[PDB]
Protein backbone atom coordinates (compact mmCIF):
# COMPACT_ATOMS: atom_id res chain seq x y z
CA UNK A 1 0.00 0.00 0.00
CA UNK A 2 2.69 2.54 1.10
CA UNK A 3 4.06 4.80 -1.68
CA UNK A 4 7.77 4.35 -2.46
CA UNK A 5 10.23 6.77 -0.86
CA UNK A 6 11.35 9.36 -3.46
CA UNK A 7 13.74 12.26 -3.67
CA UNK A 8 11.88 15.29 -5.07
CA UNK A 9 13.71 18.34 -6.55
CA UNK A 10 11.63 21.44 -7.50
CA UNK A 11 12.52 25.19 -7.77
CA UNK A 12 16.09 24.33 -6.50
CA UNK A 13 14.70 22.81 -3.28
CA UNK A 14 14.56 19.12 -2.29
CA UNK A 15 12.61 16.72 -0.14
CA UNK A 16 13.03 13.11 0.78
CA UNK A 17 9.43 11.86 0.63
CA UNK A 18 8.74 8.94 3.03
CA UNK A 19 5.20 7.59 3.29
CA UNK A 20 4.02 10.41 0.99
CA UNK A 21 5.43 13.45 2.85
CA UNK A 22 8.81 15.10 3.37
CA UNK A 23 11.04 13.42 5.98
CA UNK A 24 14.27 14.34 7.82
CA UNK A 25 16.79 11.61 8.58
CA UNK A 26 17.84 12.25 12.18
CA UNK A 27 20.32 9.52 11.66
CA UNK A 28 22.90 7.30 13.28
CA UNK A 29 25.43 5.03 11.52
CA UNK A 30 27.01 1.94 13.05
CA UNK A 31 30.69 1.18 13.14
CA UNK A 32 31.90 -0.79 10.12
CA UNK A 33 31.79 -4.28 11.75
CA UNK A 34 28.28 -4.14 13.26
CA UNK A 35 26.57 -5.65 10.18
CA UNK A 36 25.85 -9.00 11.91
CA UNK A 37 22.89 -10.27 13.97
CA UNK A 38 24.98 -10.65 17.13
CA UNK A 39 26.18 -7.00 16.95
CA UNK A 40 22.71 -5.45 16.78
CA UNK A 41 22.21 -5.64 20.62
CA UNK A 42 25.16 -3.17 20.82
CA UNK A 43 23.49 -0.84 18.23
CA UNK A 44 19.87 -0.34 19.35
CA UNK A 45 20.53 1.09 22.87
CA UNK A 46 22.65 3.92 21.38
CA UNK A 47 20.01 4.61 18.69
CA UNK A 48 17.22 4.90 21.39
CA UNK A 49 19.42 7.12 23.62
CA UNK A 50 20.17 9.34 20.59
CA UNK A 51 16.50 9.56 19.55
CA UNK A 52 17.48 8.84 15.92
CA UNK A 53 14.67 7.98 13.49
CA UNK A 54 16.87 6.20 10.92
CA UNK A 55 19.75 3.71 11.16
CA UNK A 56 22.52 3.57 8.51
CA UNK A 57 24.21 0.16 8.52
CA UNK A 58 26.29 -1.88 6.02
CA UNK A 59 25.10 -4.78 3.93
CA UNK A 60 28.32 -6.32 2.62
CA UNK A 61 28.74 -8.15 -0.69
CA UNK A 62 30.92 -10.73 1.19
CA UNK A 63 28.02 -11.57 3.58
CA UNK A 64 25.17 -11.87 0.99
CA UNK A 65 27.24 -13.80 -1.64
CA UNK A 66 30.02 -15.56 0.28
CA UNK A 67 30.20 -18.30 -2.46
CA UNK A 68 29.28 -17.22 -6.04
CA UNK A 69 25.52 -17.78 -6.72
CA UNK A 70 24.95 -18.78 -3.05
CA UNK A 71 23.01 -15.83 -1.56
CA UNK A 72 22.42 -15.29 2.18
CA UNK A 73 20.06 -12.59 3.42
CA UNK A 74 19.88 -13.91 7.03
CA UNK A 75 21.34 -10.61 8.31
CA UNK A 76 18.84 -8.47 6.38
CA UNK A 77 15.95 -10.59 7.76
CA UNK A 78 16.98 -10.01 11.41
CA UNK A 79 17.75 -6.31 10.77
CA UNK A 80 14.38 -5.57 9.17
CA UNK A 81 12.48 -7.39 11.99
CA UNK A 82 14.41 -5.58 14.78
CA UNK A 83 14.14 -2.14 13.04
CA UNK A 84 10.37 -2.62 12.66
CA UNK A 85 10.04 -3.62 16.37
CA UNK A 86 11.63 -0.24 17.24
CA UNK A 87 9.61 1.76 14.63
CA UNK A 88 12.74 3.12 12.95
CA UNK A 89 13.74 3.26 9.30
CA UNK A 90 16.89 2.03 7.58
CA UNK A 91 19.47 3.19 5.10
CA UNK A 92 21.45 0.19 3.84
CA UNK A 93 25.10 0.80 2.78
CA UNK A 94 26.09 -1.52 -0.09
CA UNK A 95 29.74 -2.31 0.64
CA UNK A 96 30.91 -3.93 -2.58
CA UNK A 97 33.35 -3.00 -5.39
CA UNK A 98 34.56 0.02 -3.26
CA UNK A 99 34.58 0.53 0.49
CA UNK A 100 37.04 3.38 1.20
CA UNK A 101 38.70 2.83 -2.25
CA UNK A 102 39.19 -0.95 -1.61
CA UNK A 103 37.52 -4.34 -2.17
CA UNK A 104 37.81 -5.59 1.43
CA UNK A 105 34.02 -6.22 1.65
CA UNK A 106 33.81 -8.00 -1.71
CA UNK A 107 33.63 -11.80 -1.33
CA UNK A 108 36.94 -13.77 -1.25
CA UNK A 109 36.11 -15.22 -4.72
CA UNK A 110 36.14 -11.58 -5.98
CA UNK A 111 38.92 -9.82 -4.07
CA UNK A 112 41.44 -12.70 -4.40
CA UNK A 113 40.86 -13.11 -8.21
CA UNK A 114 42.72 -10.12 -9.73
CA UNK A 115 42.73 -11.65 -13.25
CA UNK A 116 38.85 -11.82 -13.31
CA UNK A 117 38.32 -8.65 -11.18
CA UNK A 118 41.28 -6.39 -11.91
CA UNK A 119 42.97 -3.73 -9.81
CA UNK A 120 44.18 -0.22 -10.61
CA UNK A 121 47.70 -0.28 -12.06
CA UNK A 122 49.91 2.76 -11.34
CA UNK A 123 51.97 4.46 -14.02
CA UNK A 124 55.08 2.72 -12.71
CA UNK A 125 53.32 -0.75 -13.18
CA UNK A 126 52.81 -1.40 -9.40
CA UNK A 127 49.26 -2.53 -8.49
CA UNK A 128 46.99 -0.81 -5.92
CA UNK A 129 44.33 -2.60 -3.81
CA UNK A 130 41.54 -0.61 -5.57
CA UNK A 131 39.34 -2.33 -8.20
CA UNK A 132 39.44 -0.71 -11.65
CA UNK A 133 36.08 0.71 -12.79
CA UNK A 134 36.94 -0.63 -16.28
CA UNK A 135 36.68 -4.28 -15.02
CA UNK A 136 33.61 -5.46 -16.93
CA UNK A 137 33.45 -8.73 -14.92
CA UNK A 138 33.51 -6.78 -11.64
CA UNK A 139 30.65 -4.49 -12.82
CA UNK A 140 28.53 -7.52 -13.87
CA UNK A 141 29.21 -9.33 -10.57
CA UNK A 142 28.44 -6.29 -8.33
CA UNK A 143 25.28 -5.49 -10.34
CA UNK A 144 24.11 -9.18 -10.12
CA UNK A 145 24.52 -9.23 -6.29
CA UNK A 146 22.95 -5.78 -5.78
CA UNK A 147 19.96 -6.88 -7.92
CA UNK A 148 19.53 -9.86 -5.57
CA UNK A 149 19.54 -7.51 -2.53
CA UNK A 150 16.92 -5.31 -4.23
CA UNK A 151 14.80 -8.41 -5.02
CA UNK A 152 14.97 -9.32 -1.29
CA UNK A 153 13.63 -5.82 -0.40
CA UNK A 154 11.01 -5.96 -3.22
CA UNK A 155 9.62 -9.22 -1.75
CA UNK A 156 10.24 -8.76 2.00
CA UNK A 157 10.01 -4.93 2.58
CA UNK A 158 6.58 -3.88 1.16
CA UNK A 159 6.20 -0.96 3.78
CA UNK A 160 9.72 0.34 2.90
CA UNK A 161 11.41 0.02 6.32
CA UNK A 162 14.45 0.60 4.11
CA UNK A 163 14.00 4.14 2.70
CA UNK A 164 17.27 4.61 0.77
CA UNK A 165 20.38 2.69 -0.35
CA UNK A 166 23.97 3.96 -0.51
CA UNK A 167 25.69 2.41 -3.54
CA UNK A 168 29.33 1.59 -2.62
CA UNK A 169 31.15 3.45 0.15
CA UNK A 170 33.69 6.26 -0.46
CA UNK A 171 34.65 5.21 -4.00
CA UNK A 172 37.93 6.16 -5.64
CA UNK A 173 41.61 5.37 -5.40
CA UNK A 174 44.32 6.35 -2.91
CA UNK A 175 47.90 6.31 -4.24
CA UNK A 176 47.19 7.03 -7.95
CA UNK A 177 44.85 9.30 -10.00
CA UNK A 178 43.39 6.56 -12.26
CA UNK A 179 43.93 3.10 -13.70
CA UNK A 180 46.89 3.03 -16.11
CA UNK A 181 46.44 -0.65 -16.99
CA UNK A 182 46.67 -1.47 -20.72
CA UNK A 183 42.82 -1.94 -20.61
CA UNK A 184 42.45 1.59 -19.08
CA UNK A 185 45.03 3.29 -21.46
CA UNK A 186 43.07 1.89 -24.52
CA UNK A 187 39.98 3.81 -23.19
CA UNK A 188 41.93 6.94 -22.04
CA UNK A 189 43.96 7.30 -25.31
CA UNK A 190 40.60 7.54 -27.20
CA UNK A 191 37.55 9.89 -27.68
CA UNK A 192 35.64 11.24 -24.67
CA UNK A 193 32.08 9.78 -24.96
CA UNK A 194 29.62 11.97 -27.02
CA UNK A 195 27.24 12.16 -24.00
CA UNK A 196 29.77 13.82 -21.61
CA UNK A 197 31.15 16.31 -24.29
CA UNK A 198 27.49 17.49 -24.85
CA UNK A 199 26.40 17.70 -21.18
CA UNK A 200 29.55 19.87 -20.33
CA UNK A 201 29.45 22.22 -23.45
CA UNK A 202 32.88 21.06 -24.86
CA UNK A 203 34.51 20.15 -28.27
CA UNK A 204 35.03 16.48 -29.44
CA UNK A 205 38.39 14.72 -28.69
CA UNK A 206 40.48 12.33 -26.51
CA UNK A 207 40.55 12.66 -22.69
CA UNK A 208 43.96 14.49 -22.83
CA UNK A 209 42.70 16.75 -25.72
CA UNK A 210 39.38 17.91 -24.10
CA UNK A 211 40.35 17.94 -20.37
CA UNK A 212 44.18 18.53 -20.47
CA UNK A 213 45.79 18.50 -16.94
CA UNK A 214 42.50 17.22 -15.40
CA UNK A 215 42.25 14.28 -17.86
CA UNK A 216 43.54 11.57 -15.44
CA UNK A 217 41.26 12.58 -12.54
CA UNK A 218 38.15 13.36 -14.65
CA UNK A 219 38.66 10.04 -16.47
CA UNK A 220 38.67 8.12 -13.09
CA UNK A 221 35.61 10.05 -11.83
CA UNK A 222 33.68 9.45 -15.10
CA UNK A 223 34.45 5.68 -15.21
CA UNK A 224 33.56 5.21 -11.48
CA UNK A 225 30.47 7.39 -11.92
CA UNK A 226 29.37 5.23 -14.93
CA UNK A 227 30.02 2.04 -12.91
CA UNK A 228 27.93 3.28 -9.94
CA UNK A 229 25.13 4.55 -12.25
CA UNK A 230 24.88 1.08 -13.88
CA UNK A 231 24.65 -0.68 -10.47
CA UNK A 232 22.08 1.94 -9.41
CA UNK A 233 19.88 1.51 -12.56
CA UNK A 234 20.01 -2.35 -12.23
CA UNK A 235 18.83 -2.11 -8.62
CA UNK A 236 16.13 0.57 -9.20
CA UNK A 237 14.67 -1.63 -12.01
CA UNK A 238 13.88 -4.10 -9.16
CA UNK A 239 12.70 -1.56 -6.58
CA UNK A 240 12.96 2.18 -7.29
CA UNK A 241 14.27 3.37 -3.89
CA UNK A 242 16.28 6.53 -3.68
CA UNK A 243 20.02 5.77 -4.00
CA UNK A 244 23.08 7.86 -3.33
CA UNK A 245 26.87 7.88 -3.14
CA UNK A 246 29.01 9.20 -0.27
CA UNK A 247 32.23 11.15 -0.64
CA UNK A 248 35.61 10.86 1.01
CA UNK A 249 35.96 14.66 0.90
CA UNK A 250 38.99 16.57 -0.18
CA UNK A 251 39.75 19.68 1.84
CA UNK A 252 37.80 22.37 -0.14
CA UNK A 253 40.39 25.15 0.62
CA UNK A 254 43.64 23.15 0.19
CA UNK A 255 42.90 19.80 -1.33
CA UNK A 256 46.33 18.65 -2.45
CA UNK A 257 46.54 16.12 -5.27
CA UNK A 258 44.15 13.37 -6.43
CA UNK A 259 45.50 10.10 -4.92
CA UNK A 260 46.36 11.86 -1.64
CA UNK A 261 42.59 12.33 -1.43
CA UNK A 262 40.43 9.56 -2.87
CA UNK A 263 40.66 10.30 -6.65
CA UNK A 264 37.51 9.66 -8.70
CA UNK A 265 34.97 10.11 -5.84
CA UNK A 266 32.42 12.98 -5.97
CA UNK A 267 34.91 15.59 -4.71
CA UNK A 268 33.94 19.23 -5.25
CA UNK A 269 36.02 19.62 -8.48
CA UNK A 270 34.30 16.62 -10.24
CA UNK A 271 30.65 17.05 -9.19
CA UNK A 272 29.98 18.24 -12.81
CA UNK A 273 31.48 14.98 -14.15
CA UNK A 274 29.45 12.93 -11.61
CA UNK A 275 26.18 14.76 -12.37
CA UNK A 276 26.74 14.34 -16.19
CA UNK A 277 27.91 10.68 -15.95
CA UNK A 278 25.44 9.38 -13.35
CA UNK A 279 21.96 10.77 -13.90
CA UNK A 280 20.31 7.82 -12.04
CA UNK A 281 22.11 8.53 -8.73
CA UNK A 282 19.77 10.71 -6.66
CA UNK A 283 22.40 12.69 -4.72
CA UNK A 284 26.10 12.95 -3.77
CA UNK A 285 26.49 13.12 0.02
CA UNK A 286 29.47 14.51 1.91
CA UNK A 287 31.21 12.53 4.70
CA UNK A 288 32.28 15.26 7.09
CA UNK A 289 35.25 14.80 9.50
CA UNK A 290 36.63 18.39 9.32
CA UNK A 291 35.97 19.79 12.85
CA UNK A 292 36.39 23.53 12.13
CA UNK A 293 33.41 25.72 11.35
CA UNK A 294 34.78 27.49 8.20
CA UNK A 295 35.72 24.18 6.47
CA UNK A 296 32.45 22.45 7.40
CA UNK A 297 30.43 25.51 6.32
CA UNK A 298 32.31 25.46 2.93
CA UNK A 299 31.48 21.76 2.48
CA UNK A 300 27.75 22.38 3.16
CA UNK A 301 27.75 25.22 0.59
CA UNK A 302 29.54 23.15 -2.09
CA UNK A 303 27.24 20.07 -1.66
CA UNK A 304 23.94 22.06 -1.53
CA UNK A 305 23.05 22.74 -5.18
CA UNK A 306 19.90 23.07 -7.28
CA UNK A 307 20.98 19.64 -8.71
CA UNK A 308 22.06 18.15 -5.33
CA UNK A 309 20.00 17.60 -2.17
CA UNK A 310 22.16 17.92 0.97
CA UNK A 311 22.47 14.73 3.00
CA UNK A 312 25.23 14.65 5.58
CA UNK A 313 25.62 10.90 5.17
CA UNK A 314 28.43 10.75 7.79
CA UNK A 315 29.77 13.18 10.32
CA UNK A 316 32.19 12.72 13.22
CA UNK A 317 30.66 11.74 16.55
CA UNK A 318 32.77 14.05 18.70
CA UNK A 319 31.01 16.89 20.54
CA UNK A 320 31.95 19.74 18.10
CA UNK A 321 30.06 18.11 15.25
CA UNK A 322 26.52 18.06 16.86
CA UNK A 323 25.89 21.78 16.18
CA UNK A 324 26.31 21.26 12.39
CA UNK A 325 22.79 19.78 12.44
CA UNK A 326 21.52 23.36 12.47
CA UNK A 327 23.17 24.70 9.24
CA UNK A 328 22.58 21.34 7.56
CA UNK A 329 18.83 21.68 8.10
CA UNK A 330 18.96 25.44 7.40
CA UNK A 331 20.32 24.63 3.91
CA UNK A 332 17.25 22.47 3.20
CA UNK A 333 19.15 19.28 4.15
CA UNK A 334 17.25 16.01 4.10
CA UNK A 335 19.30 14.35 6.83
CA UNK A 336 22.28 14.12 9.11
CA UNK A 337 23.95 10.89 10.29
CA UNK A 338 26.79 10.82 12.94
CA UNK A 339 29.19 7.91 12.41
CA UNK A 340 30.10 5.22 14.94
CA UNK A 341 27.03 5.36 17.19
CA UNK A 342 27.31 1.89 18.75
CA UNK A 343 28.92 0.15 21.74
CA UNK A 344 30.99 -2.44 19.76
CA UNK A 345 34.22 -1.23 21.45
CA UNK A 346 35.55 1.05 18.73
CA UNK A 347 36.12 4.79 18.20
CA UNK A 348 37.50 6.35 15.04
CA UNK A 349 39.28 9.09 17.10
CA UNK A 350 41.13 11.18 15.90
CA UNK A 351 38.12 11.61 13.48
CA UNK A 352 35.44 11.11 16.22
CA UNK A 353 35.14 11.04 20.02
CA UNK A 354 38.15 9.80 21.96
CA UNK A 355 35.62 8.08 24.33
CA UNK A 356 32.29 6.47 23.39
CA UNK A 357 29.90 6.79 26.34
CA UNK A 358 26.46 8.06 27.22
CA UNK A 359 27.86 11.66 27.23
CA UNK A 360 29.04 11.18 23.61
CA UNK A 361 25.51 10.21 22.62
CA UNK A 362 23.87 12.92 24.72
CA UNK A 363 25.50 15.71 22.65
CA UNK A 364 23.50 14.50 19.62
CA UNK A 365 20.38 13.53 21.60
CA UNK A 366 20.09 17.14 22.87
CA UNK A 367 20.01 18.62 19.34
CA UNK A 368 17.76 15.85 17.96
CA UNK A 369 15.22 16.70 20.73
CA UNK A 370 14.74 20.13 19.08
CA UNK A 371 13.76 18.63 15.69
CA UNK A 372 12.00 15.32 16.49
CA UNK A 373 8.83 17.05 17.86
CA UNK A 374 8.37 18.97 14.61
CA UNK A 375 10.11 16.65 12.19
CA UNK A 376 7.30 16.37 9.60
CA UNK A 377 6.35 20.06 9.88
CA UNK A 378 9.99 21.14 9.51
CA UNK A 379 10.49 18.83 6.55
CA UNK A 380 7.50 20.33 4.70
CA UNK A 381 8.57 23.95 5.49
CA UNK A 382 12.12 23.10 4.34
CA UNK A 383 10.84 21.90 0.93
CA UNK A 384 7.85 24.24 0.29
CA UNK A 385 9.00 27.41 2.07
CA UNK A 386 11.80 29.32 3.71
CA UNK A 387 14.06 28.04 6.45
CA UNK A 388 17.31 29.09 8.02
CA UNK A 389 19.80 27.57 10.39
CA UNK A 390 23.07 28.57 11.99
CA UNK A 391 25.74 27.09 14.28
CA UNK A 392 28.11 28.79 16.68
CA UNK A 393 30.79 30.11 14.33
CA UNK A 394 33.89 30.06 16.53
CA UNK A 395 35.40 26.70 17.37
CA UNK A 396 36.43 25.99 20.99
CA UNK A 397 39.52 27.99 22.03
CA UNK A 398 42.71 25.76 21.55
CA UNK A 399 45.04 25.18 24.66
CA UNK A 400 47.21 28.00 23.23
CA UNK A 401 44.76 30.95 23.08
CA UNK A 402 48.97 33.26 22.95
CA UNK A 403 45.78 34.84 24.35
CA UNK A 404 47.41 35.15 27.85
CA UNK A 405 50.74 36.58 26.40
CA UNK A 406 48.59 39.28 24.69
CA UNK A 407 48.72 42.81 26.25
CA UNK A 408 45.76 44.25 28.25
CA UNK A 409 44.68 46.45 25.22
CA UNK A 410 45.10 43.45 22.81
CA UNK A 411 42.63 41.65 25.33
CA UNK A 412 39.53 44.02 25.44
CA UNK A 413 40.11 44.09 21.63
CA UNK A 414 40.09 40.26 21.56
CA UNK A 415 36.77 40.27 23.57
CA UNK A 416 35.07 42.82 21.21
CA UNK A 417 36.31 40.81 18.17
CA UNK A 418 34.99 37.51 19.61
CA UNK A 419 31.59 39.14 20.53
CA UNK A 420 31.31 40.42 16.90
CA UNK A 421 32.20 37.01 15.46
CA UNK A 422 29.63 35.31 17.76
CA UNK A 423 26.87 37.58 16.37
CA UNK A 424 25.06 36.31 13.20
CA UNK A 425 22.47 38.17 11.10
CA UNK A 426 19.67 36.43 9.18
CA UNK A 427 17.45 38.14 6.59
CA UNK A 428 13.89 36.76 7.11
CA UNK A 429 12.12 39.15 4.68
CA UNK A 430 10.28 41.89 6.63
CA UNK A 431 12.16 40.83 9.80
CA UNK A 432 15.81 39.97 10.62
CA UNK A 433 17.08 37.70 13.39
CA UNK A 434 20.33 38.26 15.25
CA UNK A 435 21.75 35.07 16.87
CA UNK A 436 24.36 35.33 19.64
CA UNK A 437 26.11 32.68 21.69
CA UNK A 438 27.19 32.36 25.34
CA UNK A 439 25.53 35.06 27.37
CA UNK A 440 23.03 35.34 30.26
CA UNK A 441 19.26 35.07 29.74
CA UNK A 442 18.78 38.66 31.03
CA UNK A 443 20.33 42.06 30.08
CA UNK A 444 22.81 42.68 27.24
CA UNK A 445 26.30 41.66 28.36
CA UNK A 446 28.08 40.85 25.04
CA UNK A 447 28.36 37.18 23.99
CA UNK A 448 31.49 35.21 24.95
CA UNK A 449 30.66 31.87 23.38
CA UNK A 450 29.78 28.49 24.87
CA UNK A 451 32.57 26.25 26.26
CA UNK A 452 32.78 24.07 24.34
CA UNK A 453 31.34 25.67 21.16
CA UNK A 454 27.86 24.07 20.80
CA UNK A 455 25.09 26.53 20.02
CA UNK A 456 22.75 26.92 17.10
CA UNK A 457 19.29 28.01 15.87
CA UNK A 458 16.58 26.99 13.39
CA UNK A 459 13.95 29.32 11.97
CA UNK A 460 11.13 28.59 9.50
CA UNK A 461 8.85 31.23 8.02
CA UNK A 462 5.14 30.57 8.64
CA UNK A 463 3.87 33.86 7.19
CA UNK A 464 5.08 37.42 6.44
CA UNK A 465 5.35 38.25 10.18
CA UNK A 466 5.39 34.79 11.84
CA UNK A 467 8.27 32.34 12.38
CA UNK A 468 8.79 28.90 13.94
CA UNK A 469 11.95 29.15 16.13
CA UNK A 470 13.97 26.66 18.19
CA UNK A 471 17.55 27.16 19.33
CA UNK A 472 20.22 25.78 21.59
CA UNK A 473 22.66 27.59 23.93
CA UNK A 474 21.89 30.81 22.07
CA UNK A 475 19.91 34.05 22.09
CA UNK A 476 17.69 34.90 19.08
CA UNK A 477 16.48 38.50 18.69
CA UNK A 478 14.05 39.84 16.02
CA UNK A 479 14.13 43.32 14.43
CA UNK A 480 12.65 45.02 11.31
CA UNK A 481 14.61 44.16 8.11
CA UNK A 482 13.99 47.58 6.46
CA UNK A 483 13.61 51.18 7.96
CA UNK A 484 9.92 51.53 9.07
CA UNK A 485 8.99 55.16 8.03
CA UNK A 486 7.59 56.53 11.30
CA UNK A 487 6.25 53.17 12.66
CA UNK A 488 7.53 51.29 15.71
CA UNK A 489 7.86 47.51 16.14
CA UNK A 490 7.29 44.86 18.76
CA UNK A 491 6.90 41.16 19.33
CA UNK A 492 3.14 40.67 19.02
CA UNK A 493 3.18 37.21 20.62
CA UNK A 494 5.53 34.30 21.36
CA UNK A 495 3.92 30.92 22.09
CA UNK A 496 5.73 27.76 23.15
CA UNK A 497 4.01 24.62 22.00
CA UNK A 498 3.97 21.51 19.95
CA UNK A 499 2.32 19.86 16.95
CA UNK A 500 -0.30 17.11 17.63
CA UNK A 501 -1.81 15.45 14.51
CA UNK A 502 -0.23 18.41 12.49
CA UNK A 503 -2.10 21.08 14.57
CA UNK A 504 -0.36 23.62 16.79
CA UNK A 505 -1.06 23.20 20.51
CA UNK A 506 -0.08 26.16 22.73
CA UNK A 507 1.48 25.36 26.10
CA UNK A 508 2.34 28.91 27.23
CA UNK A 509 3.08 32.48 26.11
CA UNK A 510 6.69 33.73 26.51
CA UNK A 511 6.57 37.36 27.66
CA UNK A 512 8.19 39.72 30.12
CA UNK A 513 11.74 38.65 31.04
CA UNK A 514 11.51 35.77 28.54
CA UNK A 515 11.15 38.24 25.58
CA UNK A 516 12.73 41.47 26.86
CA UNK A 517 16.32 40.26 26.14
CA UNK A 518 15.77 38.22 22.99
CA UNK A 519 14.65 34.58 23.10
CA UNK A 520 17.17 32.72 25.29
CA UNK A 521 17.70 28.97 24.92
CA UNK A 522 19.77 26.58 27.04
CA UNK A 523 20.14 22.84 26.45
CA UNK A 524 16.44 22.08 26.93
CA UNK A 525 14.02 21.94 23.93
CA UNK A 526 11.47 24.69 23.31
CA UNK A 527 9.53 25.18 20.06
CA UNK A 528 8.26 28.78 19.58
CA UNK A 529 5.89 30.52 17.19
CA UNK A 530 7.02 34.19 17.02
CA UNK A 531 4.66 36.82 15.60
CA UNK A 532 6.16 40.30 14.95
CA UNK A 533 4.25 43.55 14.36
CA UNK A 534 4.95 47.04 13.13
CA UNK A 535 2.47 49.60 14.48
CA UNK A 536 1.70 53.25 13.86
CA UNK A 537 2.42 55.97 16.44
CA UNK A 538 1.67 58.96 14.11
C1 LIG B 1 39.65 15.15 8.42
C2 LIG B 1 40.38 14.17 7.53
C3 LIG B 1 39.42 12.99 7.26
C4 LIG B 1 40.02 11.96 6.32
C5 LIG B 1 39.58 10.52 6.58
C6 LIG B 1 38.24 10.35 6.00
C7 LIG B 1 37.83 8.89 5.71
C8 LIG B 1 36.47 8.63 6.40
N1 LIG B 1 36.00 7.25 6.03
C9 LIG B 1 34.60 6.94 6.59
C10 LIG B 1 33.94 5.81 5.81
O1 LIG B 1 33.00 6.23 4.80
C11 LIG B 1 33.30 4.95 6.86
O2 LIG B 1 32.91 3.65 6.37
C12 LIG B 1 34.39 4.88 7.91
O3 LIG B 1 35.54 4.23 7.35
C13 LIG B 1 34.67 6.39 8.05
C14 LIG B 1 35.84 6.70 8.91
O4 LIG B 1 35.72 6.19 10.27
NA1 LIG C 1 14.67 20.38 1.90
NA1 LIG D 1 14.69 41.74 4.10
NA1 LIG E 1 16.77 44.17 5.11
NA1 LIG F 1 7.67 22.74 25.19
Author numbering: 36 to 436, 439 to 575
Show me the paper's own sentences about this structure.
This enzyme is responsible for removal of a β-galactosyl residue from the non-reducing end of its substrate, converting gangliosides GM1 and GA1 into GM2 and GA2, respectively. For the inhibitors studied here, the ligand sugar moieties have clear density in all the active sites and overlay with ring C atoms 2 to 5 in similar positions.
For all the C-1-substituents in 1, 16, 17 and 31, (an NH-octyl group in 1 and 16, and NH-C6-NH-dansyl groups in 17 and 31), and the C-5a-substituted NH-C6-NH-dansyl groups in 14 and 22, there are very few interactions between the protein and substituted derivative moieties. The most salient variation in hydrogen bonding occurs at the 2-OH group, which is present in 1, 16 and 17. The group is tethered by interactions with ND2 Asn204 (all 2.8–3.0 Å) and to both OE atoms of Glu349 (2.6–2.7 Å) Hydrogen bonding patterns for 16 and 17 are very similar, despite the different groups bound at C-1, which are probably flexible and show few polar interactions with the protein, and not surprisingly, the Ki values determined for these inhibitors with recombinant human lysosomal β-Gal are very similar.
